[PDB]
Structures are given as C-alpha cells and as structure tokens.
C-alpha cells in the first residue's frame, strides 16, 4: 500500500506537470504566429516592388 | 507646289518649325508617375505572378 501510495501521488503529480508542456507550446504558437504573418506581410509589398 | 513665293515657303517654314519644336517638347517632357516614359530610352517590365 505504501509502495501504491508513493507511486500514484508521483504520477499525479507527473499529470499536472505535463500541462506544462502544453502551455508553453500554445505560447510558442501564439508567439510564431506573429512571425507567419508579418512574413507573409513582408511576401506581399515584396510582391508588390517587385 | 512651284506657285509659291519665296516669302510663301518662308511663311511655312515657321508652321513647320513651330510643329517640330513641340513635338520635342511633347516628347521630352511627358512624364508619368516620375519616370519619362518617353523622354529616354529604356525597358521596364512588370511583375505578374508570386
């Protein structure tokens, strides 16, 4: 029982870390997005001097 | 036409110097979003795909 104990409060807590992860990639994304667009920003009026 | 005076081709002469001289004019001097477009040769090209 104490060896069940020990091992399910370290995969609780394992769980809640793993969110972690998620987060920090949606930060990522939401981060790149900005660089999708402005590149695709840059193409444009590239396009356009061209 | 051999009818004309000497003082009659005179007289055309000016109606033909007057028509030469604005036609350079026309043609250095029109002009088109800065660029002369006929004043001084040139190949310009536009850009018609990404």
């Known amino acids: 029982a104490n060896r069940f104990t020990s091992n399910i409060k370290g995969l609780t807590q ?3 870390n793993a969110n972690d992860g998620i987060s920090v990639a949606q ?7 900005e ?3 402005n590149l695709q920003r840059i193409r444009e ?6 | ?9 005179d ?8 028509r030469l001289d604005e036609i350079d004019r026309v043609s250095g ?16 090209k536009i850009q018609v795909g990404a």
């Not at chain 2, 036409?1 to 081709?9: E, I, K, M, P, Q």
């Not at chain 2, 007289?11 to 007057?18: P, R, T, Y």
């Not at chain 2, 088109?32 to 310009?44: E, I, P, Q, Y």
């Open chain 2, 29 to 44: 001097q029109t002009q088109f979003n800065g660029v002369n477009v006929l004043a001084k040769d040139g190949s310009m």
């Open chain 2, 1 to 9: 036409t051999g009818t004309n005076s000497d003082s009659d081709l």
């Open chain 1, 45 to 50: 009026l590239t396009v356009q001097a061209s």
């Open chain 1, 27 to 33: 930060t990522t994304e939401g981060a790149l997005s």
């Open chain 1, 35 to 37: 660089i999708n667009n």
């Open chain 1, 14 to 16: 394992a769980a809640r």
């Open chain 2, 11 to 18: 007289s055309i002469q000016d109606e033909i110097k007057s």
